[PDB]
Each structure stands twice: as C-alpha cells, then as structure tokens.
Write a protein that binds this ligand. Structure first.
Ligand code: APC
Ligand code: MG
Ligand code: ZN
Ligand code: ZN
Lengths: 65, 263, 147, 49, 43, 181, 133, 114, 391, 30, 56
RNA sequence: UCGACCAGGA
C-alpha cells in the first residue's frame, strides 16, 4: 500500500526506488535479485523493504469516488 | 600528524569508508552513536491538511511527509523552534513548504517530494529543498491520485535530532568493524568442525596480518584501527555527517566541562 | 507473534544506537529470547529465518512449503555462497560499548504478526465509581468503569 | 477479493456454521455397560430425506 | 474470514480426539484450545 | 487421482499424464480445459470417508510409482511403494491442512501443538481484510499501515490470496539476550 | 610480609578438561620425593607443557583496596613470571608426616601435599603464588 | 498514552542540573556525579579516558534504568587529586583528541576525487 | 490464585508506559509470563491494613514456602543461563569491565578485590566478582558427582564467608532448590537480606551477559554427519528387532507375561524397542553436541530445555500415543488409507523415525497431530476436575 | 509427451485448476 | 457465592504485565495513569500537613 | 443500564 519512504531497519530512502524497480523487472527483463542491487539496495534490511512490498494503493485507486 | 589518525579508502557523495588509527574503542563508538542520533537535521514536523480526496489517511501521509529528506546544509544557522521567541514558528526557526496536487489525467497522477514548494523565506541559506537523488529527478513518491483526487497541505519543517524522532537521522547505516582476525579474542567463534573454514573472512583481513600459529596470545594487545563506512541519507553530505559527528560529540563533552565551571 | 506460536509483548523499545549491530551496520527491528526455542521445539521458526535471510539476499521466494525436498543443509549452502556464515550466525557488537559480543547471534528476517491485543485497550484502574443498582456493589467491566 | 458465501442481515454479515450430525438410516450395534439387563443393542436412526 | 466460512460445529464416544478418518477432510491443527477443543472443526 | 493397472505400456500408472497437466496450464496462461474436464475424463474422483475404506492411496505419484534394482543424508526418512494394488494417489499431501495451517512456514519441522496455536493467532493478526475497507462502515477495523508479503511462503498461499492481502511484516529478528528486557 | 614456601617442580601432565584458557598441571618436586603438586594454570597468559622446571614460591604479602599501576617505583615482588592470589580452604592430614593444603585462586584450584612446610603454611586466606621460568 | 515525551531524553527539566556532584561515604577521595539527560554516548567515553589518568584509582558508570536519560559516574583519585579536577582533565583530553580527528579527517577528505 | 503466594504485597514504583513492570525472579510464585498476561492490583485504605500487607504479605516474607519446606523463588532464565557462563574457570574479567560490575552492586563496600591473576594482566574470575553479591558469613557445601574438595569437573559447590571457592553456579545453587543459596540467605541472613541478594546477583549477571551475549540458531540442532548415520542405523537395528518379534508372533511362538494377551504382551515389546531406540539415538546426539552448543548450554544451567527436547529436535521424535496405545486402526485394520491391512510396523502405528530438523513425513505429521491433540484435550478436560477438587 | 506420467511439481497445476473452478467458499454457496 | 464470598471491588487496577531486571524483588512498576486514578486517604496530621497541602 | 447469546485473552 504505497512504497515505504526509508527502510525501517537502517533508514536508507527506499521511497524513490519503487517506480525504477518495477521498470527494471518489466522493461529490462531483469531478475528481482539483480534489479534490487541495481537500485543500490545492498543490505537485506533495505532489500526486503522493496522485494517484499505489496502496492495495495493501486487496488484502492480502482474504486471510483 | 596528531592524536588519532585517519585513512580514507573510498569516498562518494553519500558514502565514506575510512580507517580510524590511534583511537580508543569508546571514542570510535561514541562517534558512531553521535552520527546516528545527536546530529541536527531539518524535517517536516507539522502537516496542516486542507483537502484530502486521496485513498490514503491524512496521518499516513503526514507521517510519510516527515520521513522525506530536506537540505540541512546551513542548519546550524537556524534556531530550534523551542528556543526561538515567536509564538509557534517563523523564518528564524522554520521552513514552510506547500503541496498542491490534483489528478488532471485519466492515468494515475503521482505526488513526488519534488512537488513540495518553499513558501517561507530562506534568508539566503541552503535549507528546506527536498533531497532528490532520483535519476529521473522526481525523488520519493508521497502518494497516487485518480480522477478528481485532490491534496492540499502546508508543512512546517523544523530543526531537530533523531533522538526525538528517527526522521532527523542524517545517516543511513554506519558499518563498523575492528580486529578481523580475532587476535584480541573478543569472540569465541561457534563451530561444527573448523571455525576458520566455517566463518567468512572480512574484506578488512588484507589491512592487518594473520596471527601465525606458533605465536602466543598478546594479553597486552589493544584495539585501535577501526574500519568504518558512514552512509548519508541526503540531508547533510557524508563529509559533514563525520565532521559534525566529531563537533557535536566535542560540544557534549564541552558542556559537561562548562557545567562544572558553574558549580 | 511469529507464525510458530511464538507470542510475546514488547518489554522495552530501544533506539538504533543502543541496539546490537552487525559489521555491515545492519541492526535488528526485534530481539527475541534464545530461551523460547528449546522447550517449545519450534525448529521451523529458525528454518523460516535461515530461508528468509537467503530470500532477502537472492531476491527469490523462499519455499517454506511443508512436504518438500528443501533441507536446512541445502539452505546453508546458498547462504554461504552469499558470503555469510552458513548457519545464520553473525558476529555482533554491543550498542553501548562497541565491543564485539563474545557470542555470535542468529540474525535474519522472520515474518512477525501484529496481534489485536494492544495494552491501552486493556489498562484499567477504578478507585470508587459506578455501582450496581440491586447489589450496591461495583459494576462490571472497563467499559462500564467497573471494579 | 470478497469470496461471498454469507448473508447481510439488518446490515450485518452473518455466517452459517456447518453442523456435525450423526448420519441417519445407519445400522449400528453397540455393547451395554456392566450393570445392564441388556448386553448389546442394534440401533437405526430412520428418517425421511 | 476465509477460515470462518470453512468452520464446523459439533454439539453434544471420544469426539475431541483427532480421528484417523479426518484425514484430508478436516485440518489436524485448526481447532480451539480447550472447552470446545476438538468439537469445533475446520475443513 | 485415479491409478490404473490398465497401462499397456508397462505396470500400474496414474491416469493423468503430462498431456493433461500441460492442457490445463494453457487455459491458465489464457488469463477450455477445466477441473470438471479431469472429472468427466475420469482422471480424478470424489472419495467420501466411507468409500476411503475400500481404496489404497500413494502419497506421492513419482516417489511411489516406479520400481528398483548414493542417497542424500540431508532429506527425511521415507517409505516404499511395496503396494502393487494402488487404486488412487494423493494430489498433494499438504492439502490435509485448512486455511490457517496453510500459512505456517515448514509446519513439518514443528512440535504438533505449536501449529495448533498459530492456527488461532493468524486470525487475531492485523492486515488488509478487503480493498474496499475505506467504503465500509464496520464497528472496528484494524489495518496494517505497510503490509509486506512474507519471504518464507507455501505453494498453498497462492490459492488463499495471502501474499496479496498480508498479516504482517518481515522484521529483522535477532535471537539474543540483551538488556534482559 | 615474608616468604612461606619455595621449591623447583617439574610437570608430568597438563590437562584441559573441556577448558580452552585453563589447564590442571600435575607436578613433582626435585628437592623432596614426598612432595607433589596439582594446580590449575591460566595457560593463555602462561603456557606450560610437560617437563618444565617451574620454581614455585608461596609467600604472605608483596587487606585494603586494590591499586593498579605506579609499580614503576613500587616494589614489584614479582621477579617471577606468573603471580596468583587466593585462599587456603582445607588442611588435609594425608596420614603420618604427610599434610596436604588446598588453595583456590578464584576457582583456579591447587593442592600441595608434602611435609617440611607444616609451620610455613597457614589456614589464613592471605596467600600469593609465584611461578618463574 | 503513558508514553513520556521524547525531548525528555535531552532537554533539561524545570530546576534540574546537568551535573549533580555528591561525595561518596563508602571510600575516601571518592565522588558520584549524576549526569542528567545523558546516555552511554557520553558515559562510556568519559569513563574510558578517566582510566588512562594514572592518578585515578576507580572509574565506573551505570545507567540504573533505561526509561531515564541519566547515569551515575563514580570517581576515586590518589589523595591530593580532587576527583572533580580528574573529570575536568579527562574532558579536555577527549576534546583535544576529537579536535585532532576533525583536523585529520578534514585534511584527508580534501585529498579525495569523489 | 491457587497459592498463598498468588497474591503478594509489593512497594510501588511509579514509572511511565502502560504496563505493570515486575522483577523477573518473582515470576515463578505468580506463575506469570510476559506473553500478554494481565495482573490485578489492590490499594489498601487504612494505616492498619497497610501494616497487614507490609508485615505478612510482602514478597521477601513469601520467599521460603511452607508447602514444600523450600524457597518458592530463585534465579531464572537470562540470569540463570548467564550465571553458569560467568562462573566456569575459563571466564576471566579484565579491570575496565570489573570496575563497572562492582559499581552495579548497590551495596558494594567500595573495596576493589585483589585480582585472582596478577602476573602479566591483572584478571578477575567470574566466580570472584559474583561473590561480591554474596554476603559474608554465608557458608554452603554441595558435592555432586565426583566433587572432591578439588572438583576437577568444577562440580558441586563451595562458598565460605560469602565467597565462591570452587564449582559452577547453576540451578542447583542459585535456583529455588532446597539446599541452595536462597534458602540459606533467607534462613541465616533474613528475608530483606535475601530480597537484596536476588537483585544484586541480577544486576551483575545481567550486566555481564549484556556484554557477553547469548543466542540460538539452527546450528544448535545440527548433529555431526557420522553421528547421524549412527542414529539412523540405531533406528534401523531397532526396526529390524521389531520385525523379528512381529513375524515370530505371527508364527504363533510368543508367550504372554501374566494379565496380558499375546497381543497386549507383543505391543509392550514394540513400544519398548521403539522407545529404547529414540532414547539411545537421542543420547548419541547430546553426547556429540559441543559445550558451545547454545541449546546444550541452556539445558546445562537449567534455564530452559531438557534431554528429550534435544532428542526430538536433533535425533528423532519417536513413538506417538493416544490413550496409552500407539496410533490404532481407525479405519479397518489400517491406520490410514495409505497402508495395507494388518500392518503392525513402526511406520503404520505412528513411529516418527525423523527429527524436527530433518522434517516429518505426511503420515508422521498426521500421527503426531493426533498425539498432540490428546495433550490439549487432557489439559482442558481435567482442568475443571482439578479445580473443583481445590474448591 | 502427451502420455508421459506426471511429476511431483505437476500436481500443483491440478490444484491451481481446482480452486480456479471451485473457490474456497465452494461448499457454502453450492 | 457471587455477592458475599467474592465481590467486585473499588481501589483496584489491572493491565498487561512486563518483566523488569532493574526493579527490586519487592517492587511493582505502576503506570502513571493508574497511579493518578487510584487513591490512598491520608489523615491531615502535623507530620504530613505541609506535604499534603502541596499535593492538594 | 437490563442480561442473554456469540466470539475471544492468560
Ligand atoms: N483455562 C484456564 N484456566 C485457568 N488458568 C489458565 C487457563 N489457561 C491458561 N491459564 C494460565 O496460564 C498458564 C499457562 O498458560 P500459557 O501461559 O498460555 C502457556 P506458556 O507458559 O506461554 O508456554 P508453554 O505452552 O510453553 O507452557 C497456566 O499455568 C494458568 O495459570
Ligand atoms: Mg502467559
Ligand atoms: Zn535498510
Ligand atoms: Zn521562530
């Protein structure tokens, strides 16, 4: 439900990364793992942040008013 | 040159990897803590909502807003709101931001940290500007809008430390290590068969020498030489996360010494 | 609680500085007691953690499906290939001093659940208040501000 | 994601819980306790579908 | 919610115990703890 | 799955073959050959608890269907296919479980009641319950700010829509003794 | 303030019973035949292998809080490598003219069995232990 | 709800001093300084440097409860040395040491090309 | 509230945050855990009612219990696990830390004790500075296995004048044991003196352990490769031992020991060979586990866990039981529809050949599931019956 | 092959196809 | 049994419990909320008179 | 402001 700004654990701004992460997988047909490190996500605390997030915001937007 | 020496291995706009030679562990760690909490940053700390036709909760967004990094360069030339003399805030103690967003497009219109805009006067000091490290130049997605989904906010960002809220954290994660070959015997490695073969050797093993088997234990041995990596989130540039970490800690020690003079 | 009947409440909340850290600057979000595991025999909790550690590094979904051919020895082999100690242990340093902890901590991700039992929905004190009509004794429940 | 399979009664989501009963028209022999004038019994729960 | 729409109730020899025949029909772990333990079944 | 001695090309084998298995997946990517298809082709059947008494079931198809004439020490100790008389084969043994038990990572590596416990707690866990939560006027609704799908997952979680509507977060758990809090 | 015992011993066996930093050493005296020793030694700071000439001294002094350095000008009564401090906790009469005294240096035990040092050894806690070479 | 304010971790309250210097009855030339609104960031550090002061006989520090930003420090000195004078000296050395770090870091940083 | 001890008088300490905070060693008399337990507080209104509590009901008074003629509270969990770790002859503390450890004792005499080792580095023993929490005139003697006034195993216990002379401190000393330190301080020194000893052991042990650390990983269940083959063949030789007694009883040669059918007598032997098996198979693993095994280290101090806890995790779970008998034929002459009829084999009637680390087979999983359910039922059924008995 | 026998992982395609057609509230509705 | 052998009572409190190693054996951590609702009725005596006024 | 059912907590 919308990408968290900053990783809970160490606080690296994971916020901007999302759109670019989705585009690495779709467009650059990269595997999730390589795509993650390409955005610069080195530690697994930051890595889970993106890798394990479920963007429910997109579902909620589907509701008209 | 002086007391404790320093050797910068690698450096960037957001990461400094150095070696702290000729120091005590306590000092090397006190510096770690200071960088984490005690350095002052600027962060959104009041979100006045006007309209929220969004799928998201006002407070969800409000929390989310503070967590956005803002230029904290000339922070030291800004009073803590609490110390200023105005009722609430002003230009001497606070930076005011304004966010207006509306879904004009049929396609999902997004709100970015770039979309916030300074309404207060900066008095000619590098502060307030939201940090955009983004390749595309947007940086941090606040939230998304549909059709007539509107969002109007006014934000007041103030000086503060991470010891009050982690949003005022100027640093990401400080990598810290000493004695890669366990020569100081500060660990008793858990093993199944061979401790040395089971445990991976850190990158720092090249910066020190392997102990040599037939060499007895050095009970006199002490740990100086600490391999560190300070990572900046963006608010303050890496060099300053270190420099201000050193000045803040100095000031803390100074206050004690100074308080002892009133006594 | 974890997905293993490993329930607990928070004792204390610590900021990052006082928290024990890996040489990589990674710190825990949560610290559970080693004492939980031996009596309870909740091996899967530890296996979840070793697999979830790998999953986070590799960016591949960890199959924690029951009747499979996934071994703890097999997961170890991958984690070692990721440059970590095969059984999930990691050396840690004390938050207060900075001195390496004599012991190496089993550290990694674990799916934790927020349960509906939050203290401020339970906490209650009554020192004289509403009385029952008939019995003339205190009323029942925090709801009615009873004793 | 809502699966259904329940009712909305006076604006309240009500779920009908399955009820475990013993099958009927089923022939079943059981032994009687130590102090009983009957040693065994054949029972049939005869009911119309 | 999913598990609520898949819940079974037993009113009233050793019914609380997990019988062999429950194999693949009823969940062997999903049951309440005490006073209704093994009476409330989950498909 | 129905198992037949009727297999001209050898021994006794599961009616359902690689053909059918792919035939299904084509209809899966097309999102003709449904569940009812296997039922009407008589490859799969409905066995009640009474009928269960007159049949012989193999747990695994492949692991309980060939013959014999080194081994991995890491794997668990398993039984043979000494049964010539196999009538049916279990689709997947993990289907003995219900909704709750199916969210448990490795329940085969736990003490029996610890699973029973979690098959109660997951119901008392927060998270997204429906995406229309914002348009419902229910008394009390608890929603997790940032849900995360788990890293350790079942093949069964798929069908349960769990990784789409999660129960918690993948927290960084350290099993240590700290301040004794 | 004076010496209470001195003899040159020799190791027979060094044993680490599941112990990484310590060992129990078994010794015999070159001086007297009747004199034997058993002693737990921190082999981390003082490594001992079998058949080593170890001059073992006991002595009363050289009771108030502990002062760490300044010893530069202080009388370092240690012209010995190893120095321990402990308590006499048992005085065994191992029959006839033989007497065994038990010492503990905070868990690190000791048992000196012999004869001549009857008078010399006192059930009084205050005892040091000096080992050279 | 029963949550104390966060600024209570550093902002000194109404009538509350940073240093409370009390003499220790237990031993001679001993003292106990209560550092208000402080943690191990300062504690362990001051304690450490005091140990190097050869004229300091005893230095230890404790944070009796983690709800409270405050810790105690026990200083014992050689007769004639005011333990206050010992703490006063220990701070200056820390400051000079840190000054050297800032000086050494600044110069070595300016040398980098990234 | 099934105890005199289930309700005790306590001093208030007004703290922030919404929970009732309580000392961990008073956990046992209440039988409280911190997994979401709630507790009741009652405020006396009279100056005479206050006295009633402070003079009869106070926690220090409740320390030695008259139902067992022993202390109802001792040192638990972290502090117990860490007290063993701190004690053992290999543990040595250097000056910098020793001084912090001493300051932590609120009743420290202000005297820095003479270090056990002076030679190059002045080092203190774990036992040495733990003895700072132990008050003078406390004399205790134990003797366990081969404890010989020079205990080579660091066996038993010897404390003279409130000073540890030899042996490790674990459950048998610092716990709620009959002859243990608590019952001794409470008797010799007093109730408020003992209530202090509790805190002072904790303040030191907890601190030391904070700076030493303790953990548990999957590595603690992992048994050695050759040891595993050894366990696996121990099961095999016992399953072959069963098969023997099975085909022999089928050949009508068996002879039943009085008050039992051939069937009843046979079933005893099956159960026996398979339980002998699990236990010896388990013992191989415990024996193969190093002193560094965190799980072994908890069983050792007596903080948490036992032999069977190791055995089932590392080696093998073993036989499953419902109503005393091994999983019986709920279906006709077969335990599940995955078996042929008249199968009496370990696998059929619920024998779990596997360890929890290895993982369970679907049949083993279901049989364990039936046996486990029996536990929850008995806890529920017989809990009211037991309650009415008290009433 | 169209006749080659099914594997272990193959079973999940049948399970996929089960719920794809049955659902989870199957029983309640039917 | 329900009204005379056992009663609902005033001057009572209940909340979630947590373990503290920095507490005395005989202490109990009382949340300020709870301390502020529960009350002890103290008699105005020359011994307390001055303190009591500052509380009122 | 009354008490019944249901669902839960240790
Ligand atoms: N129905 C019931 N009636 C009375 N008391 C109960 C109860 N259910 C639980 N309790 C109380 O809770 C105590 C133990 O239950 P729990 O705390 O839930 C298990 P645990 O101690 O957390 O872990 P464990 O399962 O490893 O023992 C009992 O001793 C009892 O005091
Ligand atoms: Mg509990
Ligand atoms: Zn991170
Ligand atoms: Zn202002």
């Amino acid at each position: 439900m919308i990408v968290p700004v900053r990783c809970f654990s160490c606080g690296k701004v994971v916020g901007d990364k999302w759109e670019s992460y989705l585009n690495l997988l779709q467009e650059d047909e990269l595997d999730e793992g390589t795509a993650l490190s390409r955005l610069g996500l080195k530690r697994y605390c930051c890595r889970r942040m993106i890798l394990t997030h479920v963007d429910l915001i997109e579902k909620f937007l589907r509701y008209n008013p | 040159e002086e007391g404790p020496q320093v050797k910068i291995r690698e450096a960037s706009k957001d990461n400094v990897d150095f070696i702290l030679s000729n120091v005590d562990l306590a000092m090397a760690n006190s510096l770690r803590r200071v960088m984490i909490a005690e350095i002052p940053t600027l962060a959104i700390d009041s979100v006045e909502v006007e309209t929220n036709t969004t799928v998201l909760a006002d407070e969800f967004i409000a929390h989310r807003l503070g967590l956005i990094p803002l230029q904290s360069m000339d922070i030291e030339q800004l009073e803590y709101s609490r110390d200023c003399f105005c009722e609430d805030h002003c230009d001497k103690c606070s930076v005011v931001l304004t966010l207006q967003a509306f879904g004009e497009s049929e396609s999902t219109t997004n709100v970015y940290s770039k979309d916030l805009v300074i309404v207060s006067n900066l008095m000619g000091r590098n502060i307030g500007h939201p940090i955009i490290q983004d390749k595309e130049g947007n940086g941090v997605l606040i939230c998304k809008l549909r059709k007539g989904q509107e969002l109007k906010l006014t934000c007041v960002a103030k000086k503060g430390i991470a010891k009050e809220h982690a949003k005022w954290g100027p640093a990401a994660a400080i990598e810290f290590e000493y004695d890669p070959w366990n020569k100081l015997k500060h660990t008793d490695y858990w093993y199944e068969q061979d401790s040395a073969k089971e445990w991976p050797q850190s990158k720092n093993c090249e910066y020190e020498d392997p102990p040599n088997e037939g060499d007895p234990f050095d009970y006199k041995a002490q740990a100086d030489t600490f391999y560190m990596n300070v990572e900046s989130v963006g608010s303050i540039p890496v060099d300053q996360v270190v420099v201000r970490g050193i000045d803040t800690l100095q000031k803390k020690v100074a206050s004690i010494l100074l308080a002892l003079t009133q006594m | 609680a974890s997905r293993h009947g490993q329930k607990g409440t928070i004792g204390i909340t610590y900021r990052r500085e006082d928290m024990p850290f890996t040489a990589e600057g990674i710190v825990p979000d949560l610290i559970i007691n080693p004492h939980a595991i031996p009596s309870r025999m909740t091996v899967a909790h530890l296996i979840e953690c070793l697999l979830s550690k790998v999953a986070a590094l590799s960016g591949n979904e960890g199959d924690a499906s029951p009747f499979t051919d996934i071994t703890v020895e097999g997961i170890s082999k991958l984690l070692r290939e990721h440059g970590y100690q095969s059984r999930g242990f990691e050396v840690m340093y004390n938050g207060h001093t900075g001195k390496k902890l004599m012991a190496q901590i089993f550290f990694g991700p674990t799916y934790y659940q927020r349960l509906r039992h939050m203290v401020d929905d339970k906490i209650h004190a009554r020192a004289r208040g509403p009385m029952q009509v008939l019995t003339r004794q205190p009323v029942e429940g925090r709801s009615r501000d009873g004793g | 994601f809502d699966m259904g399979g329940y009712f909305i009664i006076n604006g309240s989501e009500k779920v009908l819980i399955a009820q475990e009963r013993s099958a009927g028209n089923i022939v079943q022999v059981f032994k009687k306790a130590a102090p009983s004038p009957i040693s065994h019994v054949a029972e049939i729960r005869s009911a119309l579908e | 919610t999913l598990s609520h729409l898949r819940r079974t109730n037993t009113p009233i020899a050793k019914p609380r115990q997990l019988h062999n025949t429950h194999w693949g029909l009823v969940c062997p772990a999903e049951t309440p703890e005490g006073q209704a333990c093994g009476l409330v079944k989950n498909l | 799955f129905i198992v037949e001695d009727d297999e001209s090309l050898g021994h006794k084998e599961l009616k359902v073959r690689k053909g059918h298995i792919a035939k299904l997946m084509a209809t899966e990517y097309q999102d003709e050959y449904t569940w009812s298809s296997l039922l009407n082709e008589g490859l799969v059947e409905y066995i009640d608890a009474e009928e269960e008494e007159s049949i012989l079931i193999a747990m695994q198809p492949e692991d309980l269907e060939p013959a014999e004439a080194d081994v991995d020490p890491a794997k668990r100790i398993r039984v043979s296919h000494h049964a010539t008389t196999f009538t049916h084969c279990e689709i997947h043994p993990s289907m003995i479980l219900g909704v709750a038990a199916s969210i448990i990572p490795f329940p085969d590596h736990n003490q029996s009641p610890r699973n029973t416990y979690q098959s109660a707690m997951g119901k008392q866990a927060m998270g997204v319950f429906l995406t229309n939560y914002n348009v419902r006027m229910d008394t009390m609704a608890n929603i997790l700010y940032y849900p995360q799908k788990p890293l350790g997952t079942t093949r069964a979680m798929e069908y349960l829509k769990f990784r789409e509507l999660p129960a918690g977060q993948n927290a960084i758990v350290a099993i240590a003794c700290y301040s004794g809090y | 303030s004076n010496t209470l015992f001195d003899d040159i011993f020799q190791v027979s066996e060094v044993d680490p019973g599941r112990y990484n930093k310590v060992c129990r050493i078994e010794a015999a005296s070159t001086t007297q035949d009747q004199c034997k020793l058993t002693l737990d030694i921190n082999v981390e700071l003082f490594p001992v292998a079998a058949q080593d000439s170890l001059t073992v001294t006991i002595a009363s002094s050289l009771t108030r809080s502990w002062r760490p350095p300044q010893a530069g000008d202080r009388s370092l009564a240690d012209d010995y490598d190893y120095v321990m401090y402990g308590t006499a906790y048992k005085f065994e009469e191992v029959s006839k003219d033989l007497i065994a005294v038990y010492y503990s240096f905070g868990g690190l035990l000791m048992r000196l069995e012999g004869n001549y040092r009857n008078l010399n050894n006192l059930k009084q806690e205050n005892a040091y232990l000096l080992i050279r070479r | 709800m029963n949550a104390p304010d966060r600024f209570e971790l550093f902002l000194l309250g109404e009538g509350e001093s940073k240093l409370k210097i009390d003499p220790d009855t237990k031993a001679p030339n001993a003292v106990v300084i209560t550092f208000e609104k402080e943690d191990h960031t300062l504690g362990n550090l001051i304690r450490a440097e005091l140990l190097n002061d050869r004229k300091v006989l005893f230095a230890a520090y404790k944070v009796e409860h983690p709800f409270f930003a405050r810790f105690k420090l026990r200083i014992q000195t050689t007769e004639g040395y005011d333990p206050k004078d010992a703490l006063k000296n220990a701070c200056n050395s820390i400051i000079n040491k840190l000054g050297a770090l800032k000086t050494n870091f600044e110069t070595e940083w300016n040398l980098q090309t990234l | 509230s099934l105890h005199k001890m289930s309700m005790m008088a306590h001093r208030v300490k007004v703290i922030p945050y919404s929970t009732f905070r309580l000392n961990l060693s008073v956990t046992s008399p209440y039988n409280a855990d911190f997994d979401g337990d709630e507790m009741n507080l009652h405020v006396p209104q009279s100056e005479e009612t206050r006295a009633e509590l402070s003079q009869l009901c106070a926690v220090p008074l409740q320390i030695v219990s008259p139902q067992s003629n022993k202390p109802c509270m001792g040192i638990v969990q972290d502090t117990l696990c860490g007290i063993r770790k701190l004690t053992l002859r290999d543990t040595f503390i250097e000056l910098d830390q020793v001084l912090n450890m001493l300051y932590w004792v609120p009743d420290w005499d202000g005297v820095i004790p003479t270090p056990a080792i002076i030679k190059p580095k002045p080092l203190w023993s774990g036992k040495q500075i733990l003895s700072v929490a132990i008050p003078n005139g406390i004399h205790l003697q134990r003797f366990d296995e081969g404890t010989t006034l020079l205990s080579p195993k660091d066996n038993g216990m010897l404390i003279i004048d409130g000073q540890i002379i030899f042996g490790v401190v674990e459950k048998k000393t610092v716990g709620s044991s009959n002859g243990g330190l608590i019952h001794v301080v409470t008797r010799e020194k007093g109730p408020q003196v003992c209530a202090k000893l509790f805190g002072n052991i904790q303040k030191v042990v907890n601190f030391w352990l904070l700076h030493n650390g303790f953990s548990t990983g999957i590595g603690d269940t992992i048994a050695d490769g050759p040891t595993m083959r050894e366990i696996t063949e121990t099961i095999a030789e016992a399953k072959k031992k069963v098969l023997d007694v099975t085909k022999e009883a089928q050949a009508n040669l068996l002879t039943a020991k009085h008050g039992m059918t051939l069937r009843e007598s046979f079933e005893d032997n099956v159960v026996r060979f398979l339980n002998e098996a699990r236990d010896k198979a388990g013992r191989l693993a415990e024996v193969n586990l190093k002193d560094l095994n965190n799980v072994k280290q908890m069983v050792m101090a007596g903080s948490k866990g036992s032999f069977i806890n190791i055995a089932q995790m590392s080696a093998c779970v073993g036989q499953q039981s419902v109503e005393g008998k091994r999983i019986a034929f709920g279906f006709v002459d077969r335990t599940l529809p995955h078996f042929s009829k008249d199968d009496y084999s370990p696998e059929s009637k619920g024998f779990v050949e596997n360890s929890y680390l290895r993982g369970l087979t679907p049949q083993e999983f279901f049989f364990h599931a039936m046996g486990g359910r029996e536990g929850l039922i008995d806890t529920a059924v017989k809990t009211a019956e037991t309650g009415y008995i008290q009433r | 092959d169209e006749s080659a026998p099914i594997t272990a992982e193959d079973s999940w395609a049948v399970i996929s196809a089960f719920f794809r057609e049955k659902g989870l509230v199957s029983q309640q509705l039917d | 049994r329900g009204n005379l052998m056992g009663k609902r009572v005033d001057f009572s409190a209940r909340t979630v419990i947590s373990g503290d190693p920095n507490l005395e054996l005989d202490q109990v951590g009382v949340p300020k909320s709870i301390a502020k609702t529960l009350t002890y009725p103290e008699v105005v005596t020359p011994y307390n008179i001055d303190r009591l006024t500052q509380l009122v």
